[PDB]
JSON list of C-alpha atoms (C1' of nucleotides) in Angstrom, two decimals:
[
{"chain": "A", "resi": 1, "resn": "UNK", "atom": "CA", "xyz": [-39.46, 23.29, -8.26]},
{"chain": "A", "resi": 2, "resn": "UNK", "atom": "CA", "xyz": [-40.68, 23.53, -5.09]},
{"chain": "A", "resi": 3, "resn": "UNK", "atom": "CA", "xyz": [-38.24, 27.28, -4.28]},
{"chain": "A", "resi": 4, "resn": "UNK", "atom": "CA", "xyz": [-35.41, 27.42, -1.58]},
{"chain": "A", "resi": 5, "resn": "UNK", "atom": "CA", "xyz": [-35.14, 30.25, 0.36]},
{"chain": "A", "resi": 6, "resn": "UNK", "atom": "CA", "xyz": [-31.54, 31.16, 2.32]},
{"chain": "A", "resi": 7, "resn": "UNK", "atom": "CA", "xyz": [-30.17, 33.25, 4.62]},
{"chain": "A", "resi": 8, "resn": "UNK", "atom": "CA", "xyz": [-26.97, 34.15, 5.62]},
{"chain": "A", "resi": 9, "resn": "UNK", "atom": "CA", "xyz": [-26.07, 33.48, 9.46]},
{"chain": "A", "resi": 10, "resn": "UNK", "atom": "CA", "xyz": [-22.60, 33.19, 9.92]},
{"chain": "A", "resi": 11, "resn": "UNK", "atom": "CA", "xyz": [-19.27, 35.36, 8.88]},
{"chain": "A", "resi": 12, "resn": "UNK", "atom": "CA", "xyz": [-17.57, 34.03, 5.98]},
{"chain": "A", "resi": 13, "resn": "UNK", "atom": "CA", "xyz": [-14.48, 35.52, 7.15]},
{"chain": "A", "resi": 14, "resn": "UNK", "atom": "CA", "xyz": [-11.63, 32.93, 7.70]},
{"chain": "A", "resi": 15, "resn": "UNK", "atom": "CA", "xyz": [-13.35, 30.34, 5.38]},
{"chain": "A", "resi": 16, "resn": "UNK", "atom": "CA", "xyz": [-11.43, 29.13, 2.22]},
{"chain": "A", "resi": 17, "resn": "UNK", "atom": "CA", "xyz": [-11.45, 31.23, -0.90]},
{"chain": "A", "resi": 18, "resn": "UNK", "atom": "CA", "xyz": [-13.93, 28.93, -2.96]},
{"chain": "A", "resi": 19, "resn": "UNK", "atom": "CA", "xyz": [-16.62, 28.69, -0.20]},
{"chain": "A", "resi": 20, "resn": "UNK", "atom": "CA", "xyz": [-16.92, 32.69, -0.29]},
{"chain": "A", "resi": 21, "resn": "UNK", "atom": "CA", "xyz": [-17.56, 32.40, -4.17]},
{"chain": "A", "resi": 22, "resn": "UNK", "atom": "CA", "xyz": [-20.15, 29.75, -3.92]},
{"chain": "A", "resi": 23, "resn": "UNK", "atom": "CA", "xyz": [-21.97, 32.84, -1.95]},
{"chain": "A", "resi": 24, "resn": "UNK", "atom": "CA", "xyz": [-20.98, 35.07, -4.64]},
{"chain": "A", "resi": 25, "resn": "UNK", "atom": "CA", "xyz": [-22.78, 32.54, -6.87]},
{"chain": "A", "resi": 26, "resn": "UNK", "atom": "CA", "xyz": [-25.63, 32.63, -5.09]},
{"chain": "A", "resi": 27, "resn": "UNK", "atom": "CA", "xyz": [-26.01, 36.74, -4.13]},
{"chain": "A", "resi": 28, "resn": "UNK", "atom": "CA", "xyz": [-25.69, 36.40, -0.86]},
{"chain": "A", "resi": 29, "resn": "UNK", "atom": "CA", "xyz": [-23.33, 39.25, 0.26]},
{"chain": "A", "resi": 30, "resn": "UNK", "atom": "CA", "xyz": [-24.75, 40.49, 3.69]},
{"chain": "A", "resi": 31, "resn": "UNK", "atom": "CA", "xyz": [-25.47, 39.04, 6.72]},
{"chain": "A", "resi": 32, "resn": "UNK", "atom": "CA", "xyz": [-29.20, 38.20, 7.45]},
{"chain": "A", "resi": 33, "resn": "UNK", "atom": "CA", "xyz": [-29.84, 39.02, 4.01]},
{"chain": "A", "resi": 34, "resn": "UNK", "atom": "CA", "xyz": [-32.48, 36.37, 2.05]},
{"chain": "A", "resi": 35, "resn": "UNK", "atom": "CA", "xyz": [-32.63, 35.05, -1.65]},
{"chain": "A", "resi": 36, "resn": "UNK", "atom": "CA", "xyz": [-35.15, 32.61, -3.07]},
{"chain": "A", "resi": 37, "resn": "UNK", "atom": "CA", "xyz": [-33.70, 30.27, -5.80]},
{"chain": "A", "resi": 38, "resn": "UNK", "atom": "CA", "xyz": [-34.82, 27.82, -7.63]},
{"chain": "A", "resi": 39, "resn": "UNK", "atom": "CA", "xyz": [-33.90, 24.28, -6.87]},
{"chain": "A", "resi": 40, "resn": "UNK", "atom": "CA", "xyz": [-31.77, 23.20, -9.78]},
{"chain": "A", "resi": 41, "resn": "UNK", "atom": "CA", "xyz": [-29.07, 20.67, -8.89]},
{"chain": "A", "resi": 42, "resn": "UNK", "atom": "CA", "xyz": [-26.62, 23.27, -9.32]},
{"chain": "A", "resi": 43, "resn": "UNK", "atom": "CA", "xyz": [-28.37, 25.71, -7.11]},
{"chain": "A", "resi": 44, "resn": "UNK", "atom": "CA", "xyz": [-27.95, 23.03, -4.52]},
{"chain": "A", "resi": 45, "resn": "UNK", "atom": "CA", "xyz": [-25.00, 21.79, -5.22]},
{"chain": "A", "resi": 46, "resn": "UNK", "atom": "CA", "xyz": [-23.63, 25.44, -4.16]},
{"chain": "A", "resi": 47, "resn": "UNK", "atom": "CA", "xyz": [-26.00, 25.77, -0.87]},
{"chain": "A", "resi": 48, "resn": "UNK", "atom": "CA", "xyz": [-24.81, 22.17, 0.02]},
{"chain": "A", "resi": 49, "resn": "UNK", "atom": "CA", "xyz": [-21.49, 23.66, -0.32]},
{"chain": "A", "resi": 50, "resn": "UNK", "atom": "CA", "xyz": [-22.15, 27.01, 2.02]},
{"chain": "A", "resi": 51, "resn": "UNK", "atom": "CA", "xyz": [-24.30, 24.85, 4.18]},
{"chain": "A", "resi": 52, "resn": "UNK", "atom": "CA", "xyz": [-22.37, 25.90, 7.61]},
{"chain": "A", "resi": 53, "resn": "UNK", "atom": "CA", "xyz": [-23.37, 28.90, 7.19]},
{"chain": "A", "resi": 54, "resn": "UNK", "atom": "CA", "xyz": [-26.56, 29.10, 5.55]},
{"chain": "A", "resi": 55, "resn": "UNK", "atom": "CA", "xyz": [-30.18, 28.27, 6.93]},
{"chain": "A", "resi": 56, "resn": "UNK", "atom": "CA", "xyz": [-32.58, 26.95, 4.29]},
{"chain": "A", "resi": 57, "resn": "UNK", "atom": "CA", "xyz": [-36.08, 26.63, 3.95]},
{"chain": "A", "resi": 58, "resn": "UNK", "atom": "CA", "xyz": [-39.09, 26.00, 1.33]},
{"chain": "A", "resi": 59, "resn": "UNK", "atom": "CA", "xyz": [-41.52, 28.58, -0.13]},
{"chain": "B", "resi": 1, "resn": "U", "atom": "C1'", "xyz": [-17.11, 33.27, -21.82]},
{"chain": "B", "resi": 2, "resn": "G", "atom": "C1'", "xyz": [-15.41, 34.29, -15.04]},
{"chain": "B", "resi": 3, "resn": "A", "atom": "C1'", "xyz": [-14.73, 32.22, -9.83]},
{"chain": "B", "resi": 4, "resn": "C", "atom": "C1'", "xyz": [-17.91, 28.48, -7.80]},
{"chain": "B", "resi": 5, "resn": "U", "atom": "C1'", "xyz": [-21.60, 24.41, -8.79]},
{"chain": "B", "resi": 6, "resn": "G", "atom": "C1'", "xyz": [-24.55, 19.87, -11.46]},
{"chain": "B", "resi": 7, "resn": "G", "atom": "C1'", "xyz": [-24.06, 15.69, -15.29]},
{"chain": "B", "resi": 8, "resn": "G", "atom": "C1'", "xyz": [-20.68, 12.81, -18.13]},
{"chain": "B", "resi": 9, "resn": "G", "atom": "C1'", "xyz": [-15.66, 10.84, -20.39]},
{"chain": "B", "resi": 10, "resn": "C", "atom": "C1'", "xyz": [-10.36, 10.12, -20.00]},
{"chain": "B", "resi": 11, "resn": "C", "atom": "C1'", "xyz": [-5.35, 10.66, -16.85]},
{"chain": "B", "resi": 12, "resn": "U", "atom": "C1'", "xyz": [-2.95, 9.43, -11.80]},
{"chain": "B", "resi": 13, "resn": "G", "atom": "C1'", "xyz": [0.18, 5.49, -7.89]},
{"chain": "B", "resi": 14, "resn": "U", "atom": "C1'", "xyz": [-0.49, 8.97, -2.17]},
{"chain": "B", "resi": 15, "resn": "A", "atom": "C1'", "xyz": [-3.53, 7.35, 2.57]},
{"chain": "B", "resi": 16, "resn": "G", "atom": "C1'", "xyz": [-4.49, 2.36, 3.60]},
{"chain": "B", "resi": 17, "resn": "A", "atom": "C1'", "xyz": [-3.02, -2.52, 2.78]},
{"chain": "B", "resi": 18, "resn": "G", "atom": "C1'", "xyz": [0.11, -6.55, 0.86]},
{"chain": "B", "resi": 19, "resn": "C", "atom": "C1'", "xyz": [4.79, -10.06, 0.36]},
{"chain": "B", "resi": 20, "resn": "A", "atom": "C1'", "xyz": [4.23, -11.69, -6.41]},
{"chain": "B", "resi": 21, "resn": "C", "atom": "C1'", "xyz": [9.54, -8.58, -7.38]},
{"chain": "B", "resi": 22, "resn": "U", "atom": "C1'", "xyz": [14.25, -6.10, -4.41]},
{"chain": "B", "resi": 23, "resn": "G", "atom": "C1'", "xyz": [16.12, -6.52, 0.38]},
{"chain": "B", "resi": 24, "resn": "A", "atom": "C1'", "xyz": [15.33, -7.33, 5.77]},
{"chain": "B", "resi": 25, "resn": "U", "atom": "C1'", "xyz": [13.46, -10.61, 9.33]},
{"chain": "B", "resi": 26, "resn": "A", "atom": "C1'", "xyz": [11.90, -14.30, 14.68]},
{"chain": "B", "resi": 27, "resn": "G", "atom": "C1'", "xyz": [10.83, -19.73, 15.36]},
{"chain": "B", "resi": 28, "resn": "G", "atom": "C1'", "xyz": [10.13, -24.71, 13.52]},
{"chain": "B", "resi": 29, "resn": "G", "atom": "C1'", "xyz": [10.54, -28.48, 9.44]},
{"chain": "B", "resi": 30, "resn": "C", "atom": "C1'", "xyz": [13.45, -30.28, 5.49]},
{"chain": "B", "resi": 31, "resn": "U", "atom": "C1'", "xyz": [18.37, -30.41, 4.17]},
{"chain": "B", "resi": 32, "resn": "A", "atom": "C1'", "xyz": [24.67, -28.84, 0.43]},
{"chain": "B", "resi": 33, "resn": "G", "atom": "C1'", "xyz": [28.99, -27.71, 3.15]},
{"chain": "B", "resi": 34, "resn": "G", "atom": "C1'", "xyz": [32.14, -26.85, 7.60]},
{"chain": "B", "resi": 35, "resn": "G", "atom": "C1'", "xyz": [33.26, -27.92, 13.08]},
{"chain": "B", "resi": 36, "resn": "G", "atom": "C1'", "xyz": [33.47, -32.17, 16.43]},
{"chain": "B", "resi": 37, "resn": "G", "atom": "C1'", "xyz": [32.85, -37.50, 19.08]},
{"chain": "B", "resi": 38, "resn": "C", "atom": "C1'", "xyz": [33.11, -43.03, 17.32]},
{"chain": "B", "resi": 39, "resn": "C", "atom": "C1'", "xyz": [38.01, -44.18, 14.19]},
{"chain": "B", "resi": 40, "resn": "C", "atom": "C1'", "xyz": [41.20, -45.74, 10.14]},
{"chain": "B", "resi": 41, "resn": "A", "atom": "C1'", "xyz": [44.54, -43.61, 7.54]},
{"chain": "B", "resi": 42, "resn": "C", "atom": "C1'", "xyz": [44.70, -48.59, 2.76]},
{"chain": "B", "resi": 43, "resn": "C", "atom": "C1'", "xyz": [39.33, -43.83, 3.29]},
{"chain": "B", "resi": 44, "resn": "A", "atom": "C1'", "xyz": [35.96, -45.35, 4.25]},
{"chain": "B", "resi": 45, "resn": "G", "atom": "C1'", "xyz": [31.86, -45.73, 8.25]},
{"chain": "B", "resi": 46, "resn": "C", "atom": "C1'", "xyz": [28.21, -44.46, 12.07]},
{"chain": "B", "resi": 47, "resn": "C", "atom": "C1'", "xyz": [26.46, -40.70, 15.47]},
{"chain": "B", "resi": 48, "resn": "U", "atom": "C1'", "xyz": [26.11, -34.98, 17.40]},
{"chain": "B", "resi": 49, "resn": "A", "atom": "C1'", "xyz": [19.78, -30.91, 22.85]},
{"chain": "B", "resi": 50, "resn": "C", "atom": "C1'", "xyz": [27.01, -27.64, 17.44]},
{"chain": "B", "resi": 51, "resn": "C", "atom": "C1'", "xyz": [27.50, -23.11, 13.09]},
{"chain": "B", "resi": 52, "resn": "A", "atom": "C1'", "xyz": [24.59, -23.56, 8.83]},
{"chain": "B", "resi": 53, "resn": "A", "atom": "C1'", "xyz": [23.13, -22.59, 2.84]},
{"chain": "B", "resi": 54, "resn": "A", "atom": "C1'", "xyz": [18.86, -23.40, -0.96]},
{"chain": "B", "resi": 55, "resn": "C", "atom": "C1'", "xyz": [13.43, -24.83, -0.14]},
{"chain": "B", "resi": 56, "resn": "C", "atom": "C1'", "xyz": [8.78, -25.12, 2.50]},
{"chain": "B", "resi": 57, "resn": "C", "atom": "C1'", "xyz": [5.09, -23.72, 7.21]},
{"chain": "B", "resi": 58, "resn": "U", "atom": "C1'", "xyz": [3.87, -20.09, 10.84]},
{"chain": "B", "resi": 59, "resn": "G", "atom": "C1'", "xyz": [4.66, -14.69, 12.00]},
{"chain": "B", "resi": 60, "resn": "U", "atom": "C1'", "xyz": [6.12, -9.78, 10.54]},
{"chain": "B", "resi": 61, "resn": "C", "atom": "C1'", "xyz": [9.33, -4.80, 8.36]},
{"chain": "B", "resi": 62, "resn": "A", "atom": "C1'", "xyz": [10.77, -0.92, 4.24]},
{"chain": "B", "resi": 63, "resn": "A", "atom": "C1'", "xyz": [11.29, 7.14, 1.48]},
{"chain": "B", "resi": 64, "resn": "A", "atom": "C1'", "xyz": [14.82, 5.33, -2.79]},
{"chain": "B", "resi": 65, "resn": "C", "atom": "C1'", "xyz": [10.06, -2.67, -2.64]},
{"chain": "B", "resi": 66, "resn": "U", "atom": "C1'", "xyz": [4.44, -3.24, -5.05]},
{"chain": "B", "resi": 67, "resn": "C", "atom": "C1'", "xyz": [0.02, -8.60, -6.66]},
{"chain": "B", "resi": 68, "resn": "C", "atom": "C1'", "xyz": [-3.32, -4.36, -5.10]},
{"chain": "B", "resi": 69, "resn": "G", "atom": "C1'", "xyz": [-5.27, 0.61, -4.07]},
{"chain": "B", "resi": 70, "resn": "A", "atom": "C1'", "xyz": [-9.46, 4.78, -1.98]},
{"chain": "B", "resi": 71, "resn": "A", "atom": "C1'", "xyz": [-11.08, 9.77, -0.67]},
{"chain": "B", "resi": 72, "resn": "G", "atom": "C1'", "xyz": [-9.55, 13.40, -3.69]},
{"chain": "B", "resi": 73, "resn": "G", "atom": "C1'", "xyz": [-7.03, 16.15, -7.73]},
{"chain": "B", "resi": 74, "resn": "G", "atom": "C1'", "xyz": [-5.94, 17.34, -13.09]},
{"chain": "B", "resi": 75, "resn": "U", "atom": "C1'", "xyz": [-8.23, 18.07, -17.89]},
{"chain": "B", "resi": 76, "resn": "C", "atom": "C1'", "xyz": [-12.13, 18.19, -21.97]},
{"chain": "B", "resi": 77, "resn": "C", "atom": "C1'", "xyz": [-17.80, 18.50, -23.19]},
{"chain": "B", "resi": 78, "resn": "C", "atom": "C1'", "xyz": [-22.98, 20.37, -21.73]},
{"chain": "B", "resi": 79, "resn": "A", "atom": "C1'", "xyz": [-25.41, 23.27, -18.43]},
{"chain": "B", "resi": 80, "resn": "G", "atom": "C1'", "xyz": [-26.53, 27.02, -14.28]},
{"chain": "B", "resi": 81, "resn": "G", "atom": "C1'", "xyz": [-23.92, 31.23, -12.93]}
]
RNA sequence: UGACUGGGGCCUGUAGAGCACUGAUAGGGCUAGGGGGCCCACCAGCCUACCAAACCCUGUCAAACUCCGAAGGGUCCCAGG
């Protein structure tokens, strides 16, 4: 699977309860801060999810 | 095993729409009664740009109407986590 890499650009703060746990899914706790995932439907189906405040690229 | 997410299978009567049921409805057709002119009381008879059921055509309305009906949501299984 071609791998996904995100980064956190935007404040989660004031977003609904569910959308701050998809980040929590995906380790994303700091600002700026980068993970690179695997592409698994699931994977995506969180990032789709988060997309608002997430930019995504492929490594 | 969690939140959240992907793939499946059930359950549901809202948004929207509709007039088959319950009721409401504007106009025209068709047509019981009743009013009234022609007229005879021995009771019949003909007409009326009157009020008007039931029924049909056109046009619509409804938390306590529904022939119909999403997005979603609920739950169970397999996974990521």
């Amino acid at each position: 699977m071609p791998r996904l890499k995100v980064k956190l650009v935007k404040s989660p703060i004031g977003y609904p309860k569910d959308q701050k746990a998809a980040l929590k899914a995906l380790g994303l706790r700091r600002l700026q801060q980068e993970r690179v995932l695997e592409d698994t439907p699931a994977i995506r189906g969180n990032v789709e999810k988060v997309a608002h405040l997430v930019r995504v690229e492929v490594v």
